[PDB]
Amino acid sequence: TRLYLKAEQERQHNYLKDGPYITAEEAVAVYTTTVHWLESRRFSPIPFPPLSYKH
Amino acid sequence: KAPTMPKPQWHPPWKLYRVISGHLGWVRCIAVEPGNQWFVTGSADRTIKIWDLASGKLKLSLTGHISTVRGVIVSTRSPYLFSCGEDKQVKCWDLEYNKVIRHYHGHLSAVYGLDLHPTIDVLVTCSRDSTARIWDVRTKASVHTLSGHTNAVATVRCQAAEPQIITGSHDTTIRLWDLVAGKTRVTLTNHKKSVRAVVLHPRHYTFASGSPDNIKQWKFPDGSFIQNLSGHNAIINTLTVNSDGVLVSGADNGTMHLWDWRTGYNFQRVHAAVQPGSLDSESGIFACAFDQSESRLLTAEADKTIKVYREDDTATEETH
Amino acid sequence: KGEGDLSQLSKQYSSRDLPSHTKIKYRQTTQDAPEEVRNRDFRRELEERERAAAREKNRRWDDDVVFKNCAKGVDDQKKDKRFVNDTLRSEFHKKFMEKYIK
Amino acid sequence: EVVLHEDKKYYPTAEEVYGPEVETIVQEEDTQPLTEPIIKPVK
């Protein structure tokens, strides 16, 4: 557990100084693909639950 | 214009030509065959392993030490090597079967150095407690316990001509023993800091000792201060001497200084690098041994690496 | 004159001190017995040995997908056999700590 | 071009920390198995 947790804070520390590992184009592509999929599905987004929500 | 300025003889410089990167732990003591074919090492990886001296490959890694291996030597007369480490254990690795056969016992603390008597079949071992022991091979029976020091006994060499046994200890003193009666012949108080390496020559007399202050040099009957050598001022670990008078002192901060026996002239002053993983302050030499050819000088260092050096075929690095 | 307990002062015949391997193999003639070391060259022999050992190693299906090519596998190639000895960063510890934990 | 974490070249290479003129060998798996002796007696 010592070894996992220190390898994990080395990789969390190298996320910050080494930038995001995903490029700008490489993430805009994923985002545009999901909005195309969801509008082709007509997926109405989830509302925040009201305090007087039924179920 | 200095006294003995003009007369050191020109020795050529040494250069790396391979490093050997195999252990997982500080490689700690090197020995090499009487028949030049392969060499052997201990570690703090608790694994002895032997290596082809020509191509550098790994022949086999044989294990059995509970803790680190502080010393390993391979016998000339008999076909088996001996090992010793901080698990209080001293072992006789038979080489025809690659297995332990004697497994000496009696040291009350860790075991630092061992050496074989070159003519008769005994074995002299030096420990951390305060003592050195004369193990009788074939009986695995302590002939003598050489009880005369007051702290750890860092190294021991032994020879055929009197005086027999030389123990340099961590209580800053050398002493020279009688192998027969067991009592010390002559102790040598110098060396403000502890002595950790002695070596003998092997053509003529005159051994030499190693310490952080002022590597010195002695003379075998009675002990006689021949000379001290120059300011190699780290806490040095090893001394080795070639049959044509070159002498390498290896130290704990990575620096290793070449000399000559004749004058005392510091020749090369080589300081090697670490191999990629190690941090900068981890270079340090724990073993160095020449070949039987004495064309190869190969050092076991704290960077978990054996570094193998050779000569250089030029002429214009001339003496000052 | 009255040594320690191993000599005369004790009858404790312990096991592990029992006459095992009670004769010594001497290195016989076909190996590197010291008579065959008192004359051998060691230098030209080592040199020819390493001079001998040195020469041993001598469309229309997926055009709607987004990432049409990553164009590179490892971005050059995958053959390293390198040796970091900082033991948390060594590749042995990387493969250990991706095989077992998940 | 950004480096991924799973290779992450933390260190110089051995060839570029020791020069291209020395040799560096990474022997971490032995030949000559434990059954095969070193001395190989008269038989």
Residue B238 phi, psi (nearest 5):
-130, 150
Find chain D residues with C-beta within 8 A of A19's C-beta.
2
CA B121 – CA B145 distance, rounded (Å): 17
| Cα–Cα distance list, D15 to B13, B254, C7, D25 (Å) | 22, 20, 59, 10
**In this structure, what token pair is assigned to residue B207?**
């051994």
Q: Do D10 and C84 lie within an 8 Å CB cutoff?
A: yes
Element (H, E) at B83: strand B80-85
Chain D residues within an 8 Å CB radius of A23? 2
User: Does residue B136 sit in helix, strand or coil?
Assistant: strand
Contacts of residue B77 in chain C, CB cutoff 8 Å? 26-27, 34
DSSP state of B307: E
> Shortest CA distance to B287 belongs to which of B32, B47, B17?
B32
Strand, helix or coil for residue B287: strand
Cβ within 8 Å, pair C21-B101:
yes
**Locus of tokens 């951390």:** B128
Q: Assign 3-state DSSP to chain C and report helix, strand, coil percentages, each to 5.
A: 20, 0, 80
- DSSP-derived secondary structure for C28-72: -TTTT-GGGTSS---SHHHHHHHHHHTTS----SSTTSS-S----
Q: Mutate which of D8, D25, D36 to disrupt the B interface (most B C-beta within 10 Å)?
A: D25
Q: What's the 3-state SS for B225-286?
A: CCEECCCCCCCEEEEEECCCCCEEEEECCCEEEECCCCCCCCCCCEECCCCCCCCHHHCCEE
Find the closest chain A residue to D5 by CA distance.
A11
Contact A11 D2 (CB under 8 A): no
How far apart are the C-alpha atoms of A30 and A24, rounded to whole Å?
10
- The three-state secondary structure class of B94 is strand
Kindly compute the dihedral angle of the four CA atoms of residues D7, D12, D18, D19, in this order, to the nearest 10 degrees: 90
Beta-carbon separation of C34 and B24 below 8 A: no
The candidate with the shortest Cα–Cα distance to B173, out of B160, B158, B154, is: B154
Nominal resolution (angstroms): 3.4
Amino acid identity for residue B136 in this structure = D
Question: From edge to edge, which strands make up the β-sheet containing B165-169?
Answer: B153-158, B165-169, B173-177, B184-189
Asked if the peptide bond before residue A50 counts as cis, ω within 30 degrees of 0, the response is no
Contact B82, B93 (CB under 8 A): yes
Contact residues, A window 24-53, toward C, CB-based 8 Å cutoff = 29-30, 33
Q: And the tokens for A9?
A: 């804070």
Cβ separation D2–A23 shorter than 8 A: yes
Q: Do chains A and B touch (3 or more CB pairs under 8 A)?
A: no
C58 reaches D (C-beta below 8 A): no
Is B59 within 8 Å of chain D by CB? yes
B12 token code pair: 């050529």
Question: Do residue C88 and residue A33 have CB atoms under 8 angstroms apart?
Answer: no
B298 forms beta bridges with B289, B308
Nearest Cα residue to B250 out of B228, B269, B265: B269
Give yes or no for C97 touching A (CB within 8 A): yes
Separation between Cα atoms, residue D41 and residue B97, nearest integer Å: 10
**Cβ pair C85:B142 closer than 8 A:** no
Given a contact cutoff of 8 angstroms between Cβ atoms, the answer to whether B41 and B64 are in contact is: no
Tokens 């070249």 sit on residue: D9
A2 to each of A5, A9, C28, how far by Cα in Å?
5, 11, 54
Interface test with D, best of B16, B63, B270 (most D CBs within 10 A): B16
Asked if C72 and B114 count as a contact pair (C-beta separation under 8 A), the reply is no
**Residue C7 backbone dihedrals phi, psi, to 5 degrees:** -80, -70
Give the Cα-Cα-Cα angle D8, B23, B210 (nearest 5 degrees).
120
Q: How far is D19 from chain B (nearest CA, A)?
A: 10
B114 touches B82 (CB < 8 A): yes
**DSSP 3-state assignment of B190?**
coil
* Contact with chain A for residue D8, Cβ under 8 A: yes
Q: Residue A16 in 3-state DSSP?
A: helix
- Contact between D28 and B49 using a beta-carbon 8 Å cutoff: no
Give, as one character, the DSSP assignment of residue B104.
B
Identify the residue among A21, A22, A23, A26 best suited for mutation to test binding to D, counting D beta carbons within 10 A and taking the highest: A21
Rama region for A41: left / alpha / beta (φ>0; ψ in -120 to 50; rest): alpha
| Beta pairing, strands D23-25 & B15-20 | parallel
C34: preceding bond cis by omega (within 30 degrees): no
Cβ separation of A3 and C93 shorter than 8 Å? yes
SS3 for B305?
strand
**Which token pair is B179?**
């192998």
Backbone torsions φ then ψ of B12, nearest 5 degrees: -75, 160
What value, to the nearest 5°, has the Cα angle with vertex B245 and ends B233 and B9? 95
Experimental technique for the deposited model: cryo-EM
